[PDB]
Amino acid sequence: GSHMASADLVSSCKDKLAYFRIKELKDILNQLGLPKQGKKQDLIDRVLALLTDEQGQRHHGWGRKNSLTKEAVAKIVDDTYRKMQIQCAPDLATRSHSGSDFSFRPIEEA
């Protein structure tokens, strides 16, 4: 592309997250480590602010803590879409941008 996916990840994650019941935000905020509180608005603002104000596009190198990154948010949103009506993928990104060696996160060592 033209090196411009930021608006794609946000617009996609937001569009879906918004179209998805609190469940979506629940899983997201759950992995991030947020409190049980946080209305629909609080959560929504948190997600967008996380992939926008915490995109960490220039602060990567974790792997064992990416549960609070775009990968995580996109992971849940994707599962909700495919589980919702399957469809032909929300076109979140398809990993067709950058990053294909930092995936396959662990399982918390059981």
Structure determined by: NMR
Q: Which residue from 105, 1, 95, 10 is spatially nearest to 55, judged by alpha carbons?
A: 10
Give the ranges where the chain is alpha helix by DSSP (H): 6-19, 22-32, 40-52, 70-85
3-state SS, residue 34: coil
Q: Which residue from 110, 65, 93 is spatially nearest to 6, judged by alpha carbons?
A: 93
Q: Which residue has the tokens 């398809």?
A: 94
Let me know if 58 is exposed, middle or buried by CB neighbors in 10 A (0-12, 13-18, 19+): exposed
Cα–Cα distances in angstroms (integers) from residue 68 to residues 28, 32, 88, 104, in the given order: 8, 5, 26, 15
Which structure tokens are listed for 68?
Answer: 């609070």
Distance CA 63, CA 27 (A): 19
* 6, 8, 14, 19 alpha-carbon torsion, rounded to 10°: -170
Which structure tokens are listed for 29?
Answer: 């905020």
Distance CA 32, CA 58 (A): 19
Cα–Cα distances in angstroms (integers) from residue 27 to residues 11, 67, 96, in the given order: 19, 10, 24
* 97, 12, 23, 104 alpha-carbon torsion, rounded to 10°: 0
